[PDB]
Every structure is written in C-alpha cells, then in structure tokens.
C-alpha cells in the first residue's frame, strides 16, 4: 500500500537476510586522490558476508575523531565516482547536466565488468546500512534513468522511459511516430550506424528479420517499445547483469519487486533537499487569468509548503522525472521549471517532464487545489 509500509517491510526483511552476518569491524584504507581505485583494492578480497561488516574507512594521512564522519564521506564520494558520469562508467544520453545517468556500453575498455559488480554491492550496502536504523543511513547519490531503475526491478522496456532518459530523442523521433502517419517514412525494425566518414557501418536488427519488416501505423507502437529495449537495455545487458549480481548478494532481487521505478529512487536516494523557496524563486508562471495568477497560484504555493517531504519528492518526479534536483538546484533545470496555466477547470493537473513544466488548471477554492495536487502525485 503506502510507500512507508513498503520501506518498513523491506528494511525488516533485509535485517533478517543479514541476521547471521555480523556487523563486526573491517578496515578500508583508501586514498582521496585515487578513491575508486583504492576502494576496489580495499574490497578486492571481501566475501559476501564481509560486505555486511562495519566499514571503518581510513583516508590516507587523515585523522578523524570518529568512524561515522569518514564513512559518510566515503559513501558520498564513492557514489559520485561511480555514477556522476565523469569516469564514463555511467553516461548520459544528452551532454546536459540534468540528464539522468545510465550504464555506459561504450566506456573506456579499462573499466571492466566487475566494476559494475562493485557498484551493485555499493548500492546494496547503502540499502543495508540504512535498514539498521536512522543513525546508520547512507543514501545513494545518483540520478538514475527510469529505465535503469526498471531493469533493477526486472521490468520490460517501454518507450515512455525515453521522455525522462533521453528527452531530445523523445521530443524528436518518438513524438513524431506517436503523432504522424508512417506510410512514407520507410522505417524498418533495424537501426543503422554510420562511421565518421558518413558510410553505413552496421545494421542492428531490433528482432530476427527486423530489417525486412516495415514499420506501419498498425505496428509502430511495437517498434517504439523494441526501440526502447534495444537502446536502453540490450546494449547494456552484461553491465546490468553484473550490477545485479553484486546488488543481489546484499539485497535479494525478490525484495525490490514491491517498488516501482520512482519508489526505488526514494528508497535508495531519499526524499531529497527540496527547498520550496528555491522552487518558487525559479518557477515561471506562463499565462493564466487574473484569478489563476493571483489567487490559484497563491493557493498552490501554500499547498506545496504543506506537503510532506515524500509528497514533495513525488511532485518533482511527476514534473521533472527525478526526486533530486541537478547539482545546481532548480536553476540547473534543462528548460527552467514552468507552471503552465491549463485551459481547463477543476480537472487533474498534468506534467511534461521533458519540458519539466507543471500544467495547472484553474480552481475555485484552496481545498480544491489541495485535493487535486495530491491526487495528481498519487
């Protein structure tokens, strides 16, 4: 039912999964300047039960008053090294800074597949540590694509993931196919790759015989879903398999099945630092009657200030695709956050994540705005 019930149930399982894996102490000698490399060396001989142990992280030539400080910094720093795209272990589909991150099929060859196993164990360690109690919380610092989260849960790929994971591709190709006739496009169930000299390098079929299968109006939805499967899952099959192999050593895959993609983000990354003042200061209201701009919007901000931290997180997922702002906050959004006045009355709010944008109808009372905004994020 509720998200907190899922978390409470999930965390209690996990404490039972690790019940004869003691939280005894283990030392991790790492270096700030070569953090990912030294962390892999420090854990290279860890057994499965060793990953359940209390991590005592020693930063080289650094003294600390307690172990909690270095541990929390190590978790945050190792999350950034793994998932912030800099080392190309993960990548983004557009060279933007809001873009969600995805496993990289075309990474530098020195990043071997066992590094995705480490990343999976690290994420599982965050979930395990956080299930020990509030004082042991370790949040995953990453803004994952929805399709990668869907692959963690074991869901099939769908073209809807393009809007959040590759907004430019969704706005160009996907939206065109969804809205237009295909009889003259001469598309087939295959992808063409060209070299840097503009020559056809390779043809990759979306299924057996796909190059001889035309895309028609009657099958174009199956084409888009098979396109999502190829572009978001098939090309990273081994990377995801090794990630899941590491994750499932600490978190059995059956346990994550009770969450959907967005709930999995909240479980891993938390409800975030959603500042309503930063929200209001960077959101542009587009159009609308006087009643909307001067009364409905005032009701809106009062509602937003009354939302629980989870509801705030779901509002950002509803409108931007992730519960976490980009590094720069609300100012760092692809197109700046816009609240569009919908030309409807007393209807449900809608959103277009590839434009961020929240589409807000006009309402007749505060409690109507309260009711409808909670429904739209429910």
| CATH, residue 294 | 3.30.2410.10
Task: Evaluate whether 13 touches 133 at the Cβ level (below 8 Å).
Answer: no
Same domain, 361 and 297: yes
Same domain, 300 and 353: yes
Beta-bridge partner residues of 25: 54
Same domain, 187 and 280: no
Beta-bridge partner residues of 338: 284
Q: How far apart are the first and last CA of the chain?
A: 12
Q: Which domain holds residue 355?
A: 276-377
Task: Evaluate whether 367 touches 303 at the Cβ level (below 8 Å).
Answer: no
Task: Evaluate whether 254 touches 153 at the Cβ level (below 8 Å).
Answer: no
Kindly report the three-state secondary structure assignment for every residue of the chain.
CCHHHHHHHHHHHHHHHCCCCCCCEEEEEECCCCHHHHHHHHCCCCCCHHHHCEEEEEECCCCCCCCHHHHHHHHHHHHHHHHCCCCCCEEECCCCCCCCEEECCCCCCCCCCHHHHHHHHHHHHHHHHHHCCHHHCCCCCCCECHHHHHHHHCCCCCCCHHHHHCHHHHHHHHHHHHHCCCCCCCCECEEEEECCCCCEEEEEECCCCHHHCECCCCCHHHHHHHHHHHHHCHHHHHHHHHHHHHHHHHCCHHHHCCCCHHHHHHHHHCCCCCCHHHHHHHCEEECCCHHHHHHHHHHHHHHHHHCCHHHHHHHHHHHHCCCCCCCCHHHHCCCCCEEEEEEEECCCCEECHHHCCEEEEECCCHHHHHHHHHHHCC
Please give the backbone phi and psi of residue 190, each rounded to the nearest 5 degrees, phi first.
-160, 150
Beta-bridge partner residues of 285: 339
| Interatomic CA distance for residues 274 and 323, integer angstroms | 8
Which tokens is 178 given?
């969804």
| Interatomic CA distance for residues 148 and 264, integer angstroms | 11
| Interatomic CA distance for residues 147 and 262, integer angstroms | 11
Please give the backbone phi and psi of residue 360, each rounded to the nearest 5 degrees, phi first.
-115, 115
CA distances from 168 to 163, 302, 353, 354, 360 (A): 8, 33, 12, 8, 24
Task: Evaluate whether 329 touches 278 at the Cβ level (below 8 Å).
Answer: yes
Q: Is 334 designated active site?
A: no
Same domain, 223 and 303: no
Beta-bridge partner residues of 188: 214
Same domain, 310 and 230: no
CB atoms within 10 A of CB 378: 8
Resolution of the experimentally solved model in angstroms: 2.4
Nearest to 174 by CA among 186, 158, 190, 188: 158
| Interatomic CA distance for residues 304 and 193, integer angstroms | 46
Which tokens is 350 given?
């809608």
Residues 6+ apart with CB under 8 A from 47: none
Distance of CA 32 to the CA centre of its chain: 27
Please give the backbone phi and psi of residue 285, each rounded to the nearest 5 degrees, phi first.
-90, 125
CB atoms within 10 A of CB 218: 8
Please give the backbone phi and psi of residue 340, each rounded to the nearest 5 degrees, phi first.
-90, 130
Task: Evaluate whether 337 touches 284 at the Cβ level (below 8 Å).
Answer: yes
Q: Are strands 54-59 and 25-30 parallel, antiparallel or unpaired?
A: parallel
What angle do the packed helices 261-269 and 114-131 form, to 10 degrees?
70
Gyration radius (Cα) of the chain, Å? 23
CA distances from 266 to 25, 249, 260, 277 (A): 29, 21, 10, 22
Nearest to 354 by CA among 99, 91, 179: 99
Q: Which of 79, 269, 334, 354 is catalytic?
A: 354
Return the half-sphere exposure (C-beta side, CA atoms, 13 A cut-off) of residue 96.
17
Same domain, 217 and 294: no
Same domain, 282 and 197: no
Sheet holding 338-345, edge to edge: 284-286, 338-345, 358-362, 350-351
Task: Evaluate whether 45 touches 28 at the Cβ level (below 8 Å).
Answer: no
**CATH number for the domain that contains residue 198:** 3.30.2160.10
Same domain, 280 and 373: yes
Method: X-ray
Same domain, 227 and 297: no
Which tokens is 194 given?
């060209």
């Amino acid at each position: 039912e509720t998200f907190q019930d899922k978390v409470n149930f999930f965390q209690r399982e996990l404490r039972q999964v690790h019940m004869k894996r003691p939280h005894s102490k283990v030392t991790l000698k790492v270096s700030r300047h070569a953090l990912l490399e030294s962390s892999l060396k420090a854990t290279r001989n860890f057994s499965i039960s060793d990953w359940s142990k209390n991590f005592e992280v020693v930063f080289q030539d650094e003294e600390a008053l307690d172990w909690g400080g270095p541990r929390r910094e190590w978790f945050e720093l190792i999350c950034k090294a793994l998932f912030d795209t800099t080392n190309q272990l993960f990548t983004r589909f557009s060279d933007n800074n809001q873009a969600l991150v995805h496993p990289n099929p075309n990474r530098p060859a020195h990043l071997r597949l066992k590094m995705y196993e480490f990343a999976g164990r690290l994420v599982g360690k965050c979930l395990y540590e956080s299930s020990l109690g509030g004082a042991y919380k370790q949040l995953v610092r990453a803004r994952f694509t929805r399709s990668f989260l869907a692959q963690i849960i074991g869901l099939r790929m769908h073209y809807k993931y393009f809007e959040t994971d590759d907004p430019e591709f969704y706005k160009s190709k996907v939206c065109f196919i969804l809205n237009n006739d295909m009889s003259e496009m001469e598309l087939v169930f295959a992808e063409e790759k060209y070299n840097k000299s503009g020559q056809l390098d390779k043809v990759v079929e979306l299924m057996t015989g796909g190059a001889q299968t035309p895309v028609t109006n009657a099958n174009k939805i199956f084409y888009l879903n098979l396109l999502a499967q190829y572009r978001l899952a098939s090309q990273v099959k081994e990377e995801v398999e090794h990630f899941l192999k590491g994750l499932n050593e600490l978190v059995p895959e059956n346990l994550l099945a009770i969450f959907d993609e967005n709930e999995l983000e909240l479980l891993m990354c938390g409800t975030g630092d959603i500042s309503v003042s930063d929200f209001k200061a960077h959101a542009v209201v587009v159009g609308g009657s006087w009643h909307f701009r001067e009364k409905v919007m005032r009701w809106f901000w009062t509602v937003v200030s009354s939302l629980t931290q989870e509801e705030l997180a779901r509002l950002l997922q509803f409108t931007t695709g992730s519960s976490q702002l980009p590094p720069g906050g609300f100012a760092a959004l692809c197109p700046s956050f816009q609240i569009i006045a919908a030309p409807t009355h007393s209807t449900l709010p809608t959103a277009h994540t590839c434009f961020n944008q929240l589409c807000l109808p006009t309402y007749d009372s505060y409690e109507e705005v309260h009711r409808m905004l909670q429904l739209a994020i429910s």
